Design a protein around this nucleic acid. Structure first.
Lengths: 81, 73
DNA sequence: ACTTGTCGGTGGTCTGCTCTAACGTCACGGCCAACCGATCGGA
DNA sequence: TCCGATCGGTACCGGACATGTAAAGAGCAGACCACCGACAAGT
């Protein structure tokens, strides 16, 4: 049982403090509050809603590949912007 | 022979290090060196390499390269 | 008042399978190029 | 009894290093992810 504000704070801290792009699975496993999702689709919907809410507040999230040798996309927040 | 440098020769050794592009991250050559003392980096210039003409002993740092480690437990 | 599990849609990317109808039809390439001794199988 | 084949072996320490080609293309479908609409129940 984690409040939504705490979940969003954990997500933004994890994105800011990580210098490399993180895929959805790593965020689900690591960041607290995403481990109680009954199904993968429910987690994806919740993460999309949270990301949309954060983007609405003006936080400049950047999406790109995890690595030049990998195809999965990741998330990262630029510290300069 | 020792005193007057009769049988004296000069030997030149070449040391090379490369910072290639890795899958898990990018390698950058700089004088960060997170875990050392302060006296070790006396001879290094602003770009993390030794200065020309600076004597180097055994174990001294020539080029300081830091590579990403990745997520480890 | 705010939020979330459940439901359905677009478009892009990575991955795999099936198809194409003039006529076609049995490969070069060759090392090896030592030296001695012991043993099994044909003539 | 003789002899063309076949297999077994032949010193040590030091050192050194990493490949060189591709006769294609198109149509359809499946799995997964970044972007989204609703809707009632719990907070």
């Amino acid at each position: 049982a984690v409040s939504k504000v705490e979940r969003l704070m954990n997500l933004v801290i994890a994105l800011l403090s990580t210098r490399t792009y993180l895929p959805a699975e790593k965020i689900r496993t690591t960041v607290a509050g995403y481990a109680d999702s009954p199904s993968d689709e429910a987690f994806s919907r919740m993460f999309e809603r949270d990301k949309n809410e954060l983007r609405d507040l003006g936080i400049p999230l950047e999406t790109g590949r995890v690595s030049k040798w990998d195809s999965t996309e990741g998330y990262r927040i630029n510290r300069d912007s | 022979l020792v005193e007057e440098d009769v049988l004296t020769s000069i030997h030149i050794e070449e040391h090379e290090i490369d910072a290639r592009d890795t899958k898990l991250g990018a390698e950058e050559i700089t004088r960060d060196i997170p875990n050392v003392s302060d006296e070790v980096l006396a001879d290094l210039d602003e770009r993390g390499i030794v200065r020309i003409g600076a004597e180097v002993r055994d174990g001294d740092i020539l080029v300081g390269k830091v590579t990403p480690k990745g997520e480890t437990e």
